[PDB]
């Protein structure tokens, strides 16, 4: 019993998606990233190029769309083999060092793989980003990437302990561990449109970005549907709901965040410069694209399941999203 | 044993005593410390003296205060955890730096950091705040990696050690506060130039290695364990590696400084004042300095491929 997804946002897909996907599938075979044929097939079947082509559906340079799509594949592969499943998945001490080595390899081209098959793959993606984006944009990606790995470390930490975070911590963690920071920070790299520091770091824009990430993360928890750390288990544990009531509750929260995204967007967009405007539409396309890609004649909710204009109850760390003085 | 090679400028803010007085006050009122003994230990760091060496001419005494507050905070945070819990703790503390609406939930360090962050947001631009934010996370990542190795009985090789220690010694957030103290906004096109990234890391690495010495998982253990050196052999070896890094910094700085804008220049002067100030603060907490480096090789450290890019001008 899943409600349709409320997502009155623009759905589009890059016209060169099949071409980029073909190049991606090839890179995957050359990359050394995958141990077996079965693993490669799994990685390919993510259709990560279909995915990221929905985030940057008018990217002028197919190579930029390719590079960024590769990291989406990389991310799914690294996630499935190192974060979500293998020995490190409940071994935070070992993961902290992996995260340190992997993150260092991203920042330091001279780093060596130390027998890790994921590292040369990542260093190649990074090499592509450094040839395309400005050092400022690469730093934004780099910082977003460490942010994601910090979320995963937090999550693997939780898993080791069997700790089910509360709502506030879960959203804070999941904001990072679902991969949205580094995903959305590639928008600029894909489109070529650099957002100036003064605009990019405006509290309002920081908030729209976090909100986009949060809706996408929560649509992913949906798509996933426990001991597993997800919105449904969090609400089941912390509020004693049945699965059905948690399903309904999660959809309200998520819809409420999306309405705030839409209201703040409408306030911010008119005065936005062109680079920021493009970034903002990327946030919209990504929210929609993430939902739709998870689904794939589709059906969508015409109305939000909840329309309260105030901060989400029990989630203080996101309440500043509704603070227009601060934004 | 051997005196430190550090031909860098030493200076200290003229209002250092005034700032230290206000800081001692804030530390007392911050709720950060459980006990008087703990407040005294935090105060005994002389972090205001330390950071007043990093930003000796800051125009606004309140910015030097705000930034000095965090140095006190970082020592206190570091002095007060298993890897699994630390990963969550790091996550939570970092979120409170980023989200003013985040609530302390009885964590003694979170309001204090949020007060520091509020002061930063009343002074610095949102951009300067983000820079500090990301440096803060990087430091936390390093502390998590170090905590991880300790928990496992994993003694990192020289490469992992330096990469980690670059993060864990606290130099990233420390140096990321120079702009907020001085008010000199560094434009991103300058701040993120790889050369400036490398100068920052080098300043950081040297300050970190001098901290290893001031402590008499550190460079000497790492070398003793992986190379089978005696302590005395490792000390000489460590001194050589470090001096060699500082030579690289001095060299790269002299290449970068002349073209630098006023804000970036002030920032680089901060790196230099920081390296010296760190060394000098560590000694004092009349001095003899080595006039010459113990090793003058201009080549990358063999056995440390993660920092080799510091010596690659092509990449810079």
Domain boundaries, chain A: 1-327
- Give me the resolution in angstroms, 1 decimal: 2.3
Task: Locate A214 and state its tokens.
Answer: 């949060």
C-alpha distance from residue A294 to each of A151, A159, A184, A280, A289 (Å): 22, 25, 17, 21, 8
The CA-based dihedral angle spanning residues B135, B140, B141, B143, taken in that order and rounded to the nearest 10 degrees: 130
Calpha distance B198→B290 (Å, rounded): 24
The CA-based dihedral angle spanning residues B7, B12, B13, B14, taken in that order and rounded to the nearest 10 degrees: -130
B242 closest CA partner among B174, B290, B197, B194? B290
Q: Are the CB atoms for B243 and B5 separated by under 8 Å?
A: yes
In chain B, what residues touch A161 (CB-CB under 8 Å)? 84-85
The CA-based dihedral angle spanning residues A180, A182, A185, A189, taken in that order and rounded to the nearest 10 degrees: -130
User: In a mutagenesis test of the A interface, which of B188, B301, B310 is the best target, namely the one with the most A β-carbons within 10 Å?
Assistant: B188
- Residue A177: exposed, middle, or buried by beta-carbon count in 10 A (0-12, 13-18, 19+)? buried
Task: Locate B234 and state its tokens.
Answer: 């490792």
Q: Tokens 């071409």 — which residue?
A: A19
B91/A172 touch (CB, cutoff 8 Å), yes or no: yes
- Other C-beta atoms lying within 10 Å of the C-beta of residue B11: 15
Q: Are the CB atoms for A193 and A274 separated by under 8 Å?
A: yes
User: In a mutagenesis test of the B interface, which of A91, A94, A97 is the best target, namely the one with the most B β-carbons within 10 Å?
Assistant: A97
Q: Does B111 touch chain A (CB under 8 A)?
A: no
Residue of A nearest to B194 (CA): A135
Q: What is the 3-state secondary structure (H, E, C) of chain B?
A: CCCCECCCCCCCCCCHHHHHHHHHHHHHHCCCCCCHHHHHHHHCCCHHHHHHHHCCCCCCHHHHHHHHHHHHHHHHHHHCCCHHHHHHHHHHHHHHHHCCCCCCCCCCCHHHHHHHHHHHHHHCCHHHHHHHHHHHHHHHHHHHHHHHHHHHCCCCCHHHHHHHHHHHCCHHHHHHCHHHHHCCCCCHHHHCCHHHHHHHHHHHHHHHHHHHHHCCCCHHHHHHHHHCCCHHHHHHHHHHHHHHHHHHHHHHHHHHHHHCCHHHHHHHHHHHHHHHHHHHHHHHCCCCCECCCCCCCCCCCCCCHHHHHHHCCCCC
Task: Locate B300 and state its tokens.
Answer: 């990358």
On the CB side of A149, CA atoms within 13 Å amount to 27
In chain B, what residues touch A188 (CB-CB under 8 Å)? none
Query: By three-state DSSP, how is residue A110 classified?
Result: coil
Task: Locate A30 and state its tokens.
Answer: 């050359």
In chain A, what residues touch B96 (CB-CB under 8 Å)? 317
Instruction: Tell me the count of A-B CB pairs closer than 8 A.
Output: 158
- Other C-beta atoms lying within 10 Å of the C-beta of residue B98: 21
User: In a mutagenesis test of the A interface, which of B101, B150, B156 is the best target, namely the one with the most A β-carbons within 10 Å?
Assistant: B101
B126/A153 touch (CB, cutoff 8 Å), yes or no: no
Q: Return residues 233-272 of B near A (CB < 8 Å).
A: none
B30 closest CA partner among B1, B56, B68, B57? B68
State the nearest Cα–Cα gap between A13 and chain B, in angstroms.
32
A212 closest CA partner among A252, A171, A169, A257? A257
Residue A301 has φ and ψ, to the nearest 5°, of: -60, 135
Q: Are the CB atoms for B217 and B156 separated by under 8 Å?
A: yes
Q: Does A120 touch chain B (CB under 8 A)?
A: no
Query: By three-state DSSP, how is residue A281 classified?
Result: helix
Query: By three-state DSSP, how is residue A6 classified?
Result: strand
A316/B103 touch (CB, cutoff 8 Å), yes or no: yes
- Residue B79: exposed, middle, or buried by beta-carbon count in 10 A (0-12, 13-18, 19+)? exposed
A96/B83 touch (CB, cutoff 8 Å), yes or no: yes
Residues ≥6 apart with Cβ < 8 Å to A296: A50
Q: Are the CB atoms for A116 and A102 separated by under 8 Å?
A: yes
B140/A150 touch (CB, cutoff 8 Å), yes or no: yes
Q: Tokens 């999203």 — which residue?
A: A321
- Other C-beta atoms lying within 10 Å of the C-beta of residue A215: 28
Q: Which of B144, B167, B300 sits opposite A153 (nearest CB)?
A: B144
Calpha distance A31→A78 (Å, rounded): 13
In chain A, what residues touch B92 (CB-CB under 8 Å)? 169, 172
**Structural determination approach:** X-ray
Residues ≥6 apart with Cβ < 8 Å to B220: B212, B231, B234, B235, B238
Calpha distance B148→B81 (Å, rounded): 10
Calpha distance B316→A167 (Å, rounded): 44
Radius of gyration of chain B (CA): 19
State the nearest Cα–Cα gap between B51 and chain A, in angstroms.
25
Task: Locate A111 and state its tokens.
Answer: 């780093």
Ranges of beta strands (E only) in A102-199 are none
Calpha distance A311→A321 (Å, rounded): 7
State the nearest Cα–Cα gap between B119 and chain A, in angstroms.
14
Residue B5 has φ and ψ, to the nearest 5°, of: -85, 115
Residue A56 is given by DSSP the state: S
Q: Does B101 touch chain A (CB under 8 A)?
A: yes
Cα-Cα-Cα-Cα dihedral sign, residues A6, A12, A18, A22: negative
Calpha distance A7→A11 (Å, rounded): 9
Q: Are the CB atoms for A48 and A117 separated by under 8 Å?
A: no
Residue A301 is given by DSSP the state: B
Calpha distance A293→A183 (Å, rounded): 14
Residue of A nearest to B309 (CA): A110
Q: Does B145 touch chain A (CB under 8 A)?
A: yes
A96/B147 touch (CB, cutoff 8 Å), yes or no: yes
Residue of A nearest to B193 (CA): A135
Q: Does B84 touch chain A (CB under 8 A)?
A: yes
């Amino acid at each position: 019993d899943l409600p349709p997804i409320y997502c009155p946002l623009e759905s589009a897909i890059h016209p060169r998606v099949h071409e980029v996907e073909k190049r991606a599938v090839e890179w995957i075979r050359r990359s050394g990233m995958c141990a077996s044929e079965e693993e490669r097939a799994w990685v390919i079947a993510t259709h990560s190029a279909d995915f990221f082509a929905r985030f940057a559906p008018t990217a002028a340079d197919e190579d930029r769309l390719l590079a960024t799509s590769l990291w989406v594949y990389w991310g799914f592969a690294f996630d499935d083999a190192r974060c979500d499943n293998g020995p490190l998945s409940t071994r935070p001490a070992q993961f902290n060092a992996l995260a340190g080595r992997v993150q260092r390899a991203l920042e330091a081209p001279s780093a060596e793989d130390n027998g890790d098959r994921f590292v040369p793959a990542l260093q190649d993606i990074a090499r592509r980003f450094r040839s395309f984006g400005t050092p400022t944009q690469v730093r934004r990606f780099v910082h977003a990437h460490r942010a994601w790995l910090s979320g995963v470390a937090w999550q693997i930490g939780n898993q080791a302990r069997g700790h089910m975070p509360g709502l506030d911590d879960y959203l804070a963690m999941r904001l990072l561990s679902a991969g949205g920071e580094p995903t959305f920070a590639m928008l600029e790299i894909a489109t070529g449109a650099e957002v100036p520091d003064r605009e990019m770091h405006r509290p309002a824009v920081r908030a729209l970005t976090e909100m986009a990430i949060m809706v996408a993360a929560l649509d992913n928890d949906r798509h996933s549907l426990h001991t597993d750390q997800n919105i449904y288990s969090v609400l089941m544990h912390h509020r004693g709901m049945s699965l059905q009531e948690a399903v309904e509750e999660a959809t309200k929260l998520r819809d409420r965040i999306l309405l705030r995204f839409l209201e703040l967007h409408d306030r911010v967009r008119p005065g936005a410069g062109a680079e920021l405007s493009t970034y903002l539409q990327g946030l919209r396309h990504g929210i929609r694209g993430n939902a739709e890609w998870g689904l794939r004649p589709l059906t969508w909710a015409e109305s939000p399941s909840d329309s309260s204009p105030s901060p989400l109850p029990g989630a203080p760390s996101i309440a500043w999203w509704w603070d227009d003085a601060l934004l």
